[PDB]
Amino acid sequence: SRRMVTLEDVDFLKNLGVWVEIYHHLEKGLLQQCFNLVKKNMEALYRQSSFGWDDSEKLKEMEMEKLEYICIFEKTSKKLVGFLSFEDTVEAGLTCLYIYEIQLDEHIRGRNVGKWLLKNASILAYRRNLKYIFLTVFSANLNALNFYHHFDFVPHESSPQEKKFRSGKVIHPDYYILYTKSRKDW
Numbered sequence: 001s002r003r004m005v006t007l008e009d010v011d012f013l014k015n016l017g018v019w020v021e022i023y024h025h026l027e028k029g030l031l032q033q034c035f036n037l038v039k040k041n042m043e044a045l046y047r048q049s050s051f052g053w054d055d056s057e058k059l060k061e062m063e064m065e066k067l068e069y070i071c072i073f074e075k076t077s078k079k080l081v082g083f084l085s086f087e088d089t090v091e092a093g094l095t096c097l098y099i100y101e102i103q104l105d106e107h108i109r110g111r112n113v114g115k116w117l118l119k120n121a122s123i124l125a126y127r128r129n130l131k132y133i134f135l136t137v138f139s140a141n142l143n144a145l146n147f148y149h150h151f152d153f154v155p156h157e158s159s160p161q162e163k164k165f166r167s168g169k170v171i172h173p174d175y176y177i178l179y180t181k182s183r184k185d186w
């Protein structure tokens with residue numbers, strides 16, 4: 001058929017039939033649910049990268065004390081449908097919120113929930129006197145790459161760069177390090 005930590009704008013989620021919670025640490029059950037979303041969304045991308053995928057390794061990462069979680073659940077099912085995780089840190093001398101994950105279940109993508117999570121992360125960062133937002137992204141993840149570009153992320157000086165030599169050597173990095181300034185006004 002090809003030719004026919006007070007969060008902002010919570011009312012937006014209410015209008016979608018979802019709600020948000022902030023976690024300092026994930027409880028055992030929810031840890032497993034978030035892991036399931038990351039694995040479902042990302043396993044293939046991790047596999048094809050130099051980083052690889054290890055279930056046990058991703059799990060331990062998500063348990064790290066430094067990571068804070070913003071989680072969105074469906075009002076009817078009370079199931080997790082998305083989250084954003086981050087740490088407050090420093091990157092090359094710059095104070096930042098470093099995003100580890102932004103993950104949405106398939107059925108809730110493309111409805112401005114990604115924007116909602118990113119915007120709130122950015123606001124939180126600014127209010128914590130964190131001047132930048134940083135993240136890593138796979139070069140092969142084209143949708144995410146363009147999503148970030150739209151929200152003014154650009155490669156940090158520390159990001160790997162494309163390189164081509166007359167010798168025939170071609171270097172395509174499998175990830176970028178992106179950043180942008182945090183902002184309180186959206």
Ligand SMILES: CC(C)(COP(=O)(O)OP(=O)(O)OC[C@H]1O[C@@H](n2cnc3c(N)ncnc32)[C@H](O)[C@@H]1OP(=O)(O)O)[C@@H](O)C(=O)NCCC(=O)NCCS
Pocket residue numbers: 041100101102103104105108109110111112113114115116141142143144146147150
């Ligand atoms: C990446 C992700 C979180 C973005 O969420 P999303 O639901 O798809 O995007 P949203 O609907 O919330 O985006 C809203 C804004 O982003 C823009 N946008 C979204 N995707 C875009 C794309 N591929 N190219 C250009 N702009 C894009 C929209 O224009 C919109 O901006 P606007 O209101 O100013 O017009 C989502 O696609 C996802 O969960 N992907 C799977 C997991 C993943 O790859 N995470 C990144 C690695 S951790």
Ligand SMILES: [Cl-]
Pocket residue numbers: 045136137138141144
């Ligand atoms: Cl990615």
